[PDB]
Amino acid sequence: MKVVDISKINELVKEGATLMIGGFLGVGTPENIIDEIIRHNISNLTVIANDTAFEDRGIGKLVKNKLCKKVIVSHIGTNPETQRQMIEGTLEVELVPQGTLAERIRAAGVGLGGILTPTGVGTVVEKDKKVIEVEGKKYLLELPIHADVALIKAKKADYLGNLVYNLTAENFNPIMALAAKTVIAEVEEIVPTGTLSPNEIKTPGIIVDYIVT
Amino acid sequence: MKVVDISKINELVKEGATLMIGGFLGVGTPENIIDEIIRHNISNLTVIANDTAFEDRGIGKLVKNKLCKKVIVSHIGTNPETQRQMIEGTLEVELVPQGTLAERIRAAGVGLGGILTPTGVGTVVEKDKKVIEVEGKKYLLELPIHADVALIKAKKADYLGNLVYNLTAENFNPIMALAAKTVIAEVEEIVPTGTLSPNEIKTPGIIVDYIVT
Amino acid sequence: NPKEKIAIRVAQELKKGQLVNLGIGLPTLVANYIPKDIHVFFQSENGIIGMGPAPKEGYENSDLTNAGASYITALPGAMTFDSAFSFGIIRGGHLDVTVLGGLQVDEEGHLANWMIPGKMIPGMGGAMDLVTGAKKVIVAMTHTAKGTPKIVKKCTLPLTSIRKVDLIVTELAVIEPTDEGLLLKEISKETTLDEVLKLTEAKLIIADDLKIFA
Amino acid sequence: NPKEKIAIRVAQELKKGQLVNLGIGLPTLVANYIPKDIHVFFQSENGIIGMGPAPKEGYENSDLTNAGASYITALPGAMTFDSAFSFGIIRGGHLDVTVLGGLQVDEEGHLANWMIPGKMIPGMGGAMDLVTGAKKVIVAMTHTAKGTPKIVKKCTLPLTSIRKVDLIVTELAVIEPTDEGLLLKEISKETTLDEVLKLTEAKLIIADDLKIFA
């Protein structure tokens, strides 16, 4: 069965896990899963996400509790506690352009070895990257981003684990679901098979290993 | 003003155009748009599609009438006439693995300079492709495919031009809609704005230039 | 019968909950022999997870087909999607099994199945992505082509890819490519070890355990 | 008033039916000043085309926000979508206009607008993709950082992009980067051309056409 109790998180998320976590500034993030990780001090995590949200919400609760050793994000400006830990050197922060982050995570979920993007050419993000020219235009080679677990949020799942998202809560969730070794989806509602139409489903249940609440 | 008479095809599809045409063996192909092309004998086309369908269906009709100088496809084996023109030299047949074709078109639509794929490594596909090793694995560099016009099929458009597709007729259509300079969508029904939900639309009307029937 | 024997034996390799892609032709017959007790989900490259059998007459939908454009059904909980997503599934390692047909297989586990020079040139379609991406590739093919062996030292016909396939199933033999050579695992009970070796050009390791049942 | 002067002048640049992305802060004021006869479509990087104004009280949806996590509405005909698609719209040239804030813009047309070393390190979010991929980049910014010129010969703060922005609008001037450098097209009715040049470290080409506006 895919649906399991939330108390089971302590068993599927290890200390030192590389984790993708859905959400944009806390919108579409799996708050209950995050709350379980805090409850059990699961630490030395590497978190790949759009951002570290705010100090009081979402991924920010992980930084507030110092459970991250590294974050791979595009934005940290809304969370002074992240910047503080970055300046003090206890938190390694890797900044990625938000569109490059989407494509690199998608590349891993889709089986590509990499993508060429024009974004960040001639900026500090070119540093340590291979440059490839294609018809006399420069692109950076940006590499797939893998993770042990995807912690994602969805609006509903059907009995087979098919998911749908809602409005701007979608963002990174369906792409992280293809990219991680195991996918755990927090959902708001479990609905009957045949409630989600084939034309509407955005993540097939085959890729979802676990579901909570 | 997106909806136009089928006659407007002749202002929009030039001789020698490079065209993306949606459809999987003729399922989800814009048959009416293709029939107008044949009626005005618009020729020397370069057509990017999954296949040349069948001798009396979809894209194969353009081949029957010798309207293509070149096809970039993944499969031609259901259409003997494509094979006969190929063998005589009249038709240039570039074969691309279906999945690479999907990513080469998508790369053009989303503004990437290329993608690294492990498909085709070590085969005839590797001919004349840069090879790139990432973490000790080989990938073929595959490059974006552009077109002047995309001719796509969809099930419905709303008044704003947002599109939804039906079942396995979706295939290449939404990908090609992002990749070409101009996008002409053949649709079966026009429905009021608000019939298609923000969570259901697959192609925004902002990228659709014209709609036929 | 020869195609039956192959299809039945492939069908016993499938496990509950697996996402499976069947090539058209011989492999699609595998779906007639799934045991009850085993529920699997079928993918078609043109864009569905949850493919079902052909519709009863009058239940056809022109927008719902397999990868040969023949009419199919969608089962409850099916998903349909664009060709980028479809090959994200295939190339991204989310497909548990693919069963594909065969022109040759060689002793490196290398499959040729998309082109015969001079004769047939249909293009590869999705076959290259399927072999390079699937978690497990099972080749389902008749042991010889008019007596000519298809299991050979080095593929002579163009390769579908360099990935080592995980299992070969013919009407006479079950062969597992390995770190050092093709391992004969099983023999059909209408045949003999001697015939299988007369009809195979490639070198075969023979298993201590050596089972019967096609 | 200067933040309003800039917003009104930028809103005059918008054409009917364009897809527009406004950056947070000064650029979002642009929305208050569009003619009641120009209909535009607003994109937000977190995954919406068809954004609308903040909801009336009680009408909020926890899942519908702008790129600041502030509650918004969606207008009829909106599409919401994942972040891969969202940056395909941005990076792929399907965005007609971006209005972004600025820290420095040089005579190469190059914008610095994500970081001041030793002060701000918020990360770059979508700003690099947006500057690179929009059909048109409009920088909306105060002319000076407390008298220190912000339009300079060459950027000293980190580059958002090497792409040449298309228009600079400040409380004093409208400048269009060109292949020959910066072209000053317009000046505010409340200023004087000597003061504009005085407050610009970069070299301006003055237009024969020079207009009075903003």
Residue numbers in the entry:
A (entry chain D), B (entry chain A): 1 to 213
C (entry chain B), D (entry chain C): 2 to 215
What did the paper state?
Acetate molecules were identified in every CtfAB structure in the substrate-binding pocket directly adjacent to catalytic residue E46. Acetate 1, colored magenta, is the only location where acetate is bound in the same conformation in each structure. The conserved acetate-binding site in Wt-CtfAB is shown in Figure 4. L25 and F24 of CtfA form a hydrophobic pocket for the methyl group of acetate (301 A). The methyl group of acetate (301 A) is 3.9 Å from the CZ side chain carbon of F24 and 4.0 Å from the CD2 atom of L25. On the opposite side of the binding site, one of the polar oxygens is in good hydrogen bonding distance (2.5 Å) to the side chain NE of CtfA Q98 and 3.4 Å to the side chain ND2 of CtfA N50. The second polar oxygen of acetate is 3.0 Å from the OE2 side chain atom of the catalytic E46 residue. This oxygen is solvent exposed and connected to an extensive water-filled cavity. In T. mel CtfA, there is a contiguous hydrophobic patch between F24, L25, the methyl group of T78, and F54. This hydrophobic patch could provide both binding affinity for acetate and improved thermal stability. While it is clear from SEC and native-PAGE that multiple higher order oligomeric states of CtfAB do exist in solution, the heterotetramer is the highest-ordered state apparent in CtfAB crystals.
CtfAB then transfers the CoA from acetoacetyl-CoA to acetate to reform an acetyl-CoA and produce acetoacetate. CtfAB is a member of family 1 CoA transferases. CtfB contains the acetyl-CoA binding site and the PS01724 signature sequence which includes the catalytic glutamate residue (E46) sandwiched between two short antiparallel beta strands on the N-terminal end of an eight-stranded mixed beta sheet. CtfA contains the acetate binding site and the PS01723 signature sequence.
